[PDB]
Amino acid sequence: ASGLVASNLNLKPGECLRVRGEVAPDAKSFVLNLGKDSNNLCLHFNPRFNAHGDANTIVCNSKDDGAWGTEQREAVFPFQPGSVAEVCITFDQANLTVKLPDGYEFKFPNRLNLEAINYMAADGDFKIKCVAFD
Amino acid sequence: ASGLVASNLNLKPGECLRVRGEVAPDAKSFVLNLGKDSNNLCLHFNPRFNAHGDANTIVCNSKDDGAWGTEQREAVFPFQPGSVAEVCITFDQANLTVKLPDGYEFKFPNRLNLEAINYMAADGDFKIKCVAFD
Numbered sequence: 001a002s003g004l005v006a007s008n009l010n011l012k013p014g015e016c017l018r019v020r021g022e023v024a025p026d027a028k029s030f031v032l033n034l035g036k037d038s039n040n041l042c043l044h045f046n047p048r049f050n051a052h053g054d055a056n057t058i059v060c061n062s063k064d065d066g067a068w069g070t071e072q073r074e075a076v077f078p079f080q081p082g083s084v085a086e087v088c089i090t091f092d093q094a095n096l097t098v099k100l101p102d103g104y105e106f107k108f109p110n111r112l113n114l115e116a117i118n119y120m121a122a123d124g125d126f127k128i129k130c131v132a133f134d
Numbered sequence: 135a136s137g138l139v140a141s142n143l144n145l146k147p148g149e150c151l152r153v154r155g156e157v158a159p160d161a162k163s164f165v166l167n168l169g170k171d172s173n174n175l176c177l178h179f180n181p182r183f184n185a186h187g188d189a190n191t192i193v194c195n196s197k198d199d200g201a202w203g204t205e206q207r208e209a210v211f212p213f214q215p216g217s218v219a220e221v222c223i224t225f226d227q228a229n230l231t232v233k234l235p236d237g238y239e240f241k242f243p244n245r246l247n248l249e250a251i252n253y254m255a256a257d258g259d260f261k262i263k264c265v266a267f268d
């Protein structure tokens with residue numbers, strides 16, 4: 001439908017992005033991409049219910065000039081098909097901090113050294129209900 | 135240095151789009167555009183404080199394949215520079231309904247006969263802080 005795509009965000013370091021959406025009742029995977037543009041992502045947030053060999057695994061990665069970086073996987077999966085889920089992402093020069101629905105937080109390195117986030121895109125089995133920018 | 139631009143909005147008839155943003159302190163006016171894309175707007179929402187010869191007047195218009203239609207001016211002006219303002223928009227095949235910060239709501243004809251709104255863009259005087267779909 002695909003997913004909501006926002007540009008010109010100009011999200012600066014220290015600012016938080018709140019994204020709330022509905023996880024499809026038959027969700028297999030959904031994505032929230034953040035970065036400079038579609039080919040340069042400081043954060044590819046990919047909760048995989050069942051995809052690419054991952055079962056209930058949050059996979060994160062960066063994308064530099066179209067090239068996927070080294071994947072990072074989390075130890076929790078507070079997402080359930082057919083339920084609303086909210087994620088809070090804070091941008092910082094060194095790392096991005098992600099706060100999951102249940103309060104679990106983890107960081108992902110700002111490998112691309114972005115000084116601001118101007119691009120956000122949603123895709124997969126996640127229907128965005130609201131997005132808050134600072 | 136324009137404002138936030140969102141695409142693939144997929145807003146359907148009856149769904150309520152709530153947009154909250156900060157009006158620049160030195161804003162002479164601000165704009166929130168809704169439509170299919172930058173050249174096809176079902177709604178050019180333009181509150182003018184002091185711009186284009188108008189004072190404290192909300193000017194609305196449509197843009198079809200690039201052509202601006204006949205403007206319609208609203209009866210109220212519940213806006214102020216340097217403050218947070220939220221507007222709620224919904225639509226059907228005939229009209230768009232815009233609800234203002236003061237609870238006042240008016241209709242603007244759906245001249246593009248849109249059955250879905252996929253594009254939204256704010257200018258440099260309206261910093262979007264949150265967008266909700268309900």
Ligand SMILES: OC[C@H]1O[C@@H](O[C@H]2[C@H](O)[C@@H](O)[C@H](O)O[C@@H]2CO)[C@H](O)[C@@H](O)[C@H]1O
Pocket residue numbers: 044046052059060061068069071
């Ligand atoms: O890295 C994010 C990226 O992963 C792709 O899938 C990977 C898979 O995660 C990995 O374990 C395997 O070895 O290679 C696959 C191909 O690169 C996803 O397909 C892509 O959409 C992103 O999610």
Ligand SMILES: OC[C@H]1O[C@@H](O[C@H]2[C@H](O)[C@@H](O)[C@H](O)O[C@@H]2CO)[C@H](O)[C@@H](O)[C@H]1O
Pocket residue numbers: 178180186193194195202203205
């Ligand atoms: O119609 C939307 C369009 O208006 C342009 O300005 C008009 C102004 O609204 C009208 O009252 C005056 O007579 O002529 C101006 C120029 O044709 C804005 O410049 C444009 O950005 C839109 O807001």
